[PDB]
Design an enzyme around this catalytic site. Structure first.
Site, PDB file in Angstrom:
ATOM      1  CG  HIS B  41      98.941  46.330  43.518  1.00  0.00           C
ATOM      2  ND1 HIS B  41      99.280  44.989  43.611  1.00  0.00           N
ATOM      3  CD2 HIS B  41      99.294  46.784  42.295  1.00  0.00           C
ATOM      4  CE1 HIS B  41      99.811  44.677  42.442  1.00  0.00           C
ATOM      5  NE2 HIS B  41      99.847  45.727  41.624  1.00  0.00           N
ATOM      6  N   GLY B 143     104.069  47.049  35.303  1.00  0.00           N
ATOM      7  CA  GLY B 143     102.867  46.917  34.493  1.00  0.00           C
ATOM      8  C   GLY B 143     102.417  45.481  34.297  1.00  0.00           C
ATOM      9  CB  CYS B 145     100.538  43.957  38.688  1.00  0.00           C
ATOM     10  SG  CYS B 145     102.062  44.093  39.648  1.00  0.00           S
TER      11      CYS B 145
HETATM   12  O1  LIG Z   1     104.719  46.841  38.657  1.00  0.00           O
HETATM   13  C1  LIG Z   1     105.118  46.157  39.594  1.00  0.00           C
HETATM   14  C2  LIG Z   1     106.242  45.185  39.339  1.00  0.00           C
HETATM   15  C3  LIG Z   1     105.958  43.855  39.313  1.00  0.00           C
HETATM   16  C4  LIG Z   1     106.937  42.854  39.033  1.00  0.00           C
HETATM   17  O2  LIG Z   1     106.712  41.642  39.075  1.00  0.00           O
HETATM   18  N1  LIG Z   1     108.198  43.310  38.763  1.00  0.00           N
HETATM   19  C5  LIG Z   1     108.569  44.645  38.768  1.00  0.00           C
HETATM   20  C6  LIG Z   1     109.879  45.015  38.467  1.00  0.00           C
HETATM   21  C7  LIG Z   1     110.222  46.355  38.436  1.00  0.00           C
HETATM   22  C8  LIG Z   1     109.280  47.326  38.701  1.00  0.00           C
HETATM   23  C9  LIG Z   1     107.978  46.975  39.017  1.00  0.00           C
HETATM   24  C10 LIG Z   1     107.604  45.632  39.054  1.00  0.00           C
HETATM   25  N2  LIG Z   1     104.543  46.217  40.815  1.00  0.00           N
HETATM   26  C11 LIG Z   1     103.445  47.165  41.061  1.00  0.00           C
HETATM   27  C12 LIG Z   1     103.687  47.942  42.344  1.00  0.00           C
HETATM   28  N3  LIG Z   1     103.926  47.021  43.460  1.00  0.00           N
HETATM   29  C13 LIG Z   1     103.057  46.948  44.550  1.00  0.00           C
HETATM   30  C14 LIG Z   1     102.471  48.109  45.069  1.00  0.00           C
HETATM   31  C15 LIG Z   1     101.591  48.024  46.139  1.00  0.00           C
HETATM   32  C16 LIG Z   1     101.291  46.802  46.702  1.00  0.00           C
HETATM   33  C17 LIG Z   1     101.865  45.651  46.197  1.00  0.00           C
HETATM   34  C18 LIG Z   1     102.748  45.713  45.130  1.00  0.00           C
HETATM   35  C19 LIG Z   1     105.014  46.061  43.238  1.00  0.00           C
HETATM   36  C20 LIG Z   1     104.810  45.293  41.933  1.00  0.00           C
END
Ligand SMILES: O=C(c1cc(=O)[nH]c2ccccc12)N1CCN(c2ccccc2)CC1
Ligand SMILES: O=C(c1cc(=O)[nH]c2ccccc12)N1CCN(c2ccccc2)CC1
EC number: 3.4.19.12
Lengths: 304, 304
Positions: B41, B143, B145
């Site tokens: 992603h 961030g 991920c």
């Molecule tokens: O950065 C994060 C994220 C991960 C996490 O564990 N907790 C969060 C809490 C608040 C804000 C973001 C997060 N992403 C990255 C975009 N996202 C995503 C986008 C396309 C396909 C699949 C997933 C979802 C997960």
């Protein structure tokens, strides 16, 4: 989102763990520069542990009687000195993996990571709090002595703890990196009274703030309180009294959530008086006090 | 003595964390040998996250569009391929800090350490369990991920998890190091049902054994039970059914304590039916299921 009992990454500290052997006894040591730090009880036998004369014991010892091994390389000891309850063994080689480091004495209520070690090898890392009575609720077995506690500010490792003993009551006692024990503890196999322990109120409140940030809001109520009223409740429940300094340290979490610290205190007052009633806060059925306002802010902001 | 939620030392894994940037999006990567692994992603924008055609998205991308940085050195990307939900970016340089490593798919009920990362830097390490519904109860922010889960057998790192997403419900989902998600999860910003979750019965029992080893014995009672009777109680309390395999895995803890597994099951049956009654086991006011019989044995024997 999510709130875990998070330890610091232990890499820089693993690169400092060595094995110190003296006679039959073996424990861990911290190699930073050309000096290896370890508890002085490494020069003891299971006859003199009741009351050892460490001055007379270290006199019977020569540099060659102290075996220092890091991984598989034997280190050459050129000096030995006792500083309070720790030995500083001068080695002819500086540790190439020495990180930027400080020797700090933490206060009760402060937290740190412990890298538990056996024979100079790391077995695991966990997050601890220095209880108000200067004991730690660790996980340490025979050979764990010399395991250190630390914190990491960007690239700096602040060595705050070195493990020396387990009290018959199951809690752990040790020194700072200068050999001065936290609390009234001495390094003898004698029954030692760990003082009465209280709950770190400012940490419990910070962990209530972490719960509001992470979605758990059942405990929030229609009440406020005063510092003096809240302290009447805190005293009855064996909780540390809340000062104005604690209210100031809780400033950032109060600003980030829009809940004034005294409103949060009132929610804690009803949690103390009425209990959790079978509910949970951050996956816990009790009030967690081993996360400082600094830990909650760092974990809810991702500081590397 | 003492029982802590202990994570593995993260050193070997910190030496593998890199920063992967693609367009505006940045996440973490695992550099092992001349390949950097990261969630696919990273090639997405906040317009196509609802339903992305990853094949068409990766087609618009060239090797130079993937910035890989380890600490402060920029790595040169020479290849790019998508394997399920992860990208494998070939770099012209092997990681000098590559440990002995395996890519393993763990089972639900198994545990591992997570090294949470932001911009290729480690912020903390914690111990996790792969819930029966294939989610993890982590602590991950924007961030995070690309953060990996792992276990360490002496010097071997078994990479079992890579973080991809947080479900709107607060739990975390991700893939193994081959890009295959644990559970029914897909990498889209869509509401995804994490199945019904149960309690890992064999781990709760192992943690009861850890409590007997560490002195807490109030829960032990004058009763025994059968597997079939215990499973009637376990089903009502949303607990995983206990098999003969679980009774065999509990063999070592049963031998070490002298308490037959079915006697321990009977104590758990009364803990489930009558509750903790305001008491604690290993400092916890609830039944802990994130320690396997292997974790309890390793922590109560000090395996480095
Ligand atoms: O950065 C994060 C994220 C991960 C996490 O564990 N907790 C969060 C809490 C608040 C804000 C973001 C997060 N992403 C990255 C975009 N996202 C995503 C986008 C396309 C396909 C699949 C997933 C979802 C997960
Ligand atoms: O190895 C341990 C130890 C540490 C621990 O935290 N937990 C244990 C649990 C079981 C068995 C031993 C331990 N020692 C080392 C001898 N010891 C000692 C001897 C002289 C002066 C001061 C202390 C007490 C602590």
């Amino acid at each position: 989102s999510g709130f875990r009992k998070m330890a610091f990454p232990s890499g820089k500290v693993e690169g400092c763990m060595v094995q110190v052997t003296c006679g039959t006894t073996t424990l861990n040591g911290l190699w930073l520069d050309d000096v290896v730090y370890c508890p002085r009880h490494v020069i003891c036998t299971s006859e003199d542990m009741l009351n050892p004369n460490y001055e007379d014991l270290l006199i019977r010892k020569s540099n060659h009687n102290f075996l220092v091994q890091a991984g598989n390389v034997q280190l050459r000891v050129i000096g030995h000195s006792m500083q309070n309850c720790v030995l500083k063994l001068k080695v002819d080689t500086a540790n190439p993996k020495t990180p930027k480091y400080k020797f700090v004495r933490i206060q009760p209520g402060q937290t740190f990571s412990v890298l538990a070690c056996y024979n100079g090898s790391p077995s695991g890392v966990y997050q601890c709090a220095m209880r108000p009575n200067f004991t730690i609720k660790g996980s340490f077995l025979n050979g764990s002595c010399g395991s250190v506690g630390f914190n990491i500010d960007y690239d700096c490792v602040s060595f705050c703890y070195m493990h020396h003993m387990e009290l018959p009551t199951g809690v752990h006692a040790g020194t700072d990196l200068e050999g001065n024990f936290y609390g009234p503890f001495v390094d003898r196999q004698t029954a030692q009274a760990a003082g009465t322990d209280t709950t770190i109120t400012v940490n419990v409140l910070a962990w209530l703030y972490a719960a509001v940030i992470n979605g758990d809001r059942w405990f929030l109520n229609r009440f406020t309180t005063t510092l003096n009223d809240f302290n009447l409740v805190a005293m009855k429940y064996n909780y540390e009294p809340l000062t104005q300094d604690h209210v100031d340290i809780l400033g950032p979490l109060s600003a980030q959530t829009g809940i004034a610290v005294l409103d949060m205190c009132a929610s804690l007052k009803e949690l103390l008086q009425n209990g959790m009633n079978g509910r949970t806060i951050l996956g816990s059925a009790l009030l967690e006090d081993e996360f400082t306002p600094f830990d909650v802010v760092r974990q809810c902001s991702g500081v590397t």
